[PDB]
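quick one
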Amino acid sequence: MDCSTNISPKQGLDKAKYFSGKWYVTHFLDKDPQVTDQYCSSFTPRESDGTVKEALYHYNANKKTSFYNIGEGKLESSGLQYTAKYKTVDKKKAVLKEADEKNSYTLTVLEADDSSALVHICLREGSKDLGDLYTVLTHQKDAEPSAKVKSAVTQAGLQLSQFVGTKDLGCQYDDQFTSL
Ligand code: HEM
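structure w/ protoporphyrin IX containing FE:
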């Protein structure tokens, strides 16, 4: 199941509302039904003169394990969207493995406001796509997304009822890692 070819970023988004603070995934939709594990994630994206770099955390709620990454790439000219290469780091941001240039993720921002955002992520590992992933983001763990971001979900052709809510999963975060 490949990622969709019909994803595009929202025009006119203030990139300032996106590349701010830290984000927590409050709700996610993975289109591939062959997955079992559920995750929590938080990340801190930053941008300077067209270059994006972000510190990323995942917690596998089923296996009770976590992993850390640093992603980097360039903003597209055309809207709020980037394809990143990523390295694997430990919790103090020391590099464990440098980026495998055959892997990447493309992150497309569909909405962003002062409290909330909606993004699409297509993760590719060599030939293989992990399929569409949509994530509703908030700055405050277990907060509700804004009405604007909830509208963006519907306008993306999705239904919020179909997303997994992470606030109930028993997430463990590393707020040290995502702060600054
Ligand atoms: C709750 C939300 C999310 C879920 C359910 C999720 C799901 C997954 C899964 C299943 C994997 C493992 C793929 C594999 O086994 O090879 C993975 C890895 C990865 N995800 Fe996420 N993801 C989430 C959020 C994000 C976000 C927000 C980003 C980027 C901003 C992202 C980027 C990545 C990257 C770079 C990896 C590869 C990690 C590595 O190989 O070291 N994910 N994700």
